[PDB]
Design a protein around this ligand. Structure first.
Ligand SMILES: [Fe+3]
Ligand SMILES: [Ru+3]
Length: 649
């Protein structure tokens, strides 16, 4: 078939679709995607048609992306319209709350202030802020305008019912729903703030830049952050009410046909997109505005495949829209994310011994669990520093640090009889890594090595190795020992995965093992009874030091590659306080005074430590760690990181 059935919501849109269908047939070969045109009465009918497999694709505003995600529709974002420019594609805008500098209040102190809105029923100006504030509104919250009129002391809410709720028009009497009103729209709401009518303007990240050319003027303004702090107006990416995708093509989550849709649209923009100047133009139409796509669009970007609608819309936006749609209002239990049947059994027991203060969700991989913390299905997990990096890039923050005694030591272990090996040159040698992306076995050693050879294709530096998480055909999977689909997997059914697995990898096959300072002592001298380790002696192994010589294993203090940031618990900023407080209550009750090895927490850890200043991944991991990880991800995978980076480069 190879047919993409596009859904139109108007007769004009169907006519353009039909033109679209006919022109693509001149540019796409026989074996290529074709266009079919389905005509429905509304966006929701298109959503339902696609879910019913009567059509396949439609482009929607953010609100309808949410509707399309809810059961029984279950559509997913697949292609994004971008704007502005090809070198700097603009896919999202940011809803922000702008205030005057030194006005002395935060997001959680908006009650009784004067508010400026773009217009009632608009996203940045109304639905997003009121959605976020919904449970702060006084009861009864229906009708919504009466509740807002009793929340702010006075407002300019263009198009509000000022006859029944005059407070909403105090700053623009009559609540004029047109440009005839000086405070209507994006520039109008900001002017409401600039002129001193209101205390806060609910606008987009760009509004202040388009109305105030001089930076000195903009320096008299600030942004309200959802964490109840303020930031300058050029830091909206760390200080907004919501991140909003402008226009998104959706498709069924299963059954697609996403690859066809992208193939179709990518070819359409190459032949009929911006500045192509054919008789057919994808981003205009002689009759009507914004048919099928926005006329201001400059092209399409493929949405990363790990992305679902909740992750695409973002936590803040989904919170606001859900409050509007559902209208439900209440620390509460901390929902821990477990990774295996063995990890879930542990926290299940933790939950019942915590008497409800702990609850348990399970996902099949670390990244899935991270996605659940981002969208609110989960709340906290403990992660290696490399995953704290991914969690941080995805908007999460470190809340507590696992303390085992300043971090643990990353060391390079070699067999003592191999006296030739030095850190100075290990090219062509066989390497053993915890897994790609982890602190001790990858980010620290391969970050340092990156500085020496100025590239990160390490399978061409080492002859072969085991680095679980590498591509199955890579030479860094050749030494691994998992069988079938398990070979080179970053989990337990790969016997060379982890701190201990990488040491075993060295004992049996490798030349160098990148692990931590306790690994060799803990799996030598009979402490590990498994046949591969049982008769090993730790004086038969040395550590490579940075200067180029070697020392014994217990001399790691003066022969390590770098100090490693300890594993940390991560959560969202809105649960940071509660997770901080509930876990210290839990370790006071069940602390150091797992059934297998290292479930939920490292068994080395004695306590969960306070972070104080270092409550962001950049400040927790440190400057050089982040730089090295930034260097290594040019060669790295991680579909989650790709999805998070798509929303924040
Ligand atoms: Fe680690
Ligand atoms: Ru007409």
């Amino acid at each position: 078939d190879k047919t993409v059935r596009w859904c139109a919501v108007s007769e004009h849109e169907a006519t353009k679709c039909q033109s679209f269908r006919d022109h693509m047939k001149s540019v796409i070969p026989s074996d290529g995607p074709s266009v079919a045109c389905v005509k429905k009465a509304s966006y929701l009918d298109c959503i339902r048609a696609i879910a019913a497999n009567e059509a396949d694709a439609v482009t929607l505003d953010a609100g309808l992306v949410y509707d399309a995600y809810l059961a029984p529709n279950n559509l997913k974002p697949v292609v994004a319209e971008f704007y502005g420019s090809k070198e700097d594609p603009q896919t999202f805008y940011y809803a922000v709350a702008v205030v005057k500098k030194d006005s002395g209040f935060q997001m959680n102190q908006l009650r009784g202030k004067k508010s400026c809105h773009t217009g009632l029923g608009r996203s940045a100006g109304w639905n997003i802020p009121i959605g976020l504030l919904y449970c702060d509104l006084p009861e009864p919250r229906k009708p919504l305008e009466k509740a807002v009129a009793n929340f702010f002391s006075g407002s300019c809410a263009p198009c509000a019912d000022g006859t029944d709720f005059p407070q909403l028009c105090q700053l623009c009497p009559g609540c004029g729903c047109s440009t005839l009103n000086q405070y209507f729209g994006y520039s109008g709401a900001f002017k409401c703030l600039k002129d001193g009518a209101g205390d806060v303007a609910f606008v987009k990240h760009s509004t202040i830049f388009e109305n105030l050319a001089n930076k000195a003027d903009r320096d008299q303004y600030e942004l309200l952050c959802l964490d109840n702090t303020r930031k300058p107006v050029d830091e909206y990416k760390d200080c907004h009410l919501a991140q909003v995708p402008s226009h998104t093509v959706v498709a069924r989550s299963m059954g697609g046909k996403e690859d066809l849709i992208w193939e179709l649209l990518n070819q359409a923009q190459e032949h009929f997109g911006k500045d192509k100047s054919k008789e057919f133009q994808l981003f205009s139409s002689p009759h009507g505005k914004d048919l099928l796509f926005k006329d201001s669009a400059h092209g399409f970007l493929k949405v990363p495949p790990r992305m679902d609608a909740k992750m695409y819309l973002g936590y803040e936006y989904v919170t606001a829209i859900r409050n509007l749609r559902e209208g439900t209002c209440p620390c509460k239990p901390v929902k821990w994310c477990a990774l295996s049947h063995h990890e879930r059994l542990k926290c299940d027991e933790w939950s019942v011994n915590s008497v409800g203060k702990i609850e348990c969700v399970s996902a099949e991989t670390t990244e899935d669990c991270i996605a659940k913390i981002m969208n609110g299905e989960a709340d906290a997990m403990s992660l290696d520093g490399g995953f704290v990096y991914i969690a941080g890039k995805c908007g999460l923050v470190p809340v507590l640090a696992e303390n085992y005694n300043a971090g643990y030591f990353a060391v390079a272990v070699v067999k003592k009889s191999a006296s030739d090996l030095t850190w100075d040159n290990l090219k062509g040698k066989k390497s053993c890594h915890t897994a790609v992306g982890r602190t001790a076995g990858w980010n620290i050693p391969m970050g340092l090595l990156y500085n020496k050879i100025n590239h990160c294709r390490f399978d061409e530096f080492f002859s072969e190795g085991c680095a679980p998480g590498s591509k199955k055909d890579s030479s860094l999977c050749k030494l691994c020992m998992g069988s079938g689909l398990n070979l080179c997997e970053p989990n337990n059914k790969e016997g060379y995965y982890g701190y201990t697995g990488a040491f075993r990898c060295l004992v049996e096959k490798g030349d160098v093992a990148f692990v931590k300072h306790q690994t060799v002592p803990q799996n030598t001298g009979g402490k590990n009874p498994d046949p591969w380790a049982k008769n090993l002696n730790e004086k038969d192994y040395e550590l490579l030091c940075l200067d180029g010589t070697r020392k014994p294993v217990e001399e790691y203090a003066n022969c390590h590659l770098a100090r490693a940031p300890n594993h940390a618990v991560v959560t969202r900023k809105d649960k940071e306080a509660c997770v901080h407080k509930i876990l210290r209550q839990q370790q006071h009750l069940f602390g150091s005074n797992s059934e297998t090895k290292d479930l939920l927490f490292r068994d080395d850890t004695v306590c969960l430590a306070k972070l104080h200043d270092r409550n962001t991944y950049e400040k927790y991991l440190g400057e050089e760690y982040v730089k090295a990880v930034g260097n290594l991800r040019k060669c790295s995978t991680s579909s989650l990181l790709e999805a998070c980076t798509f929303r924040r480069p």
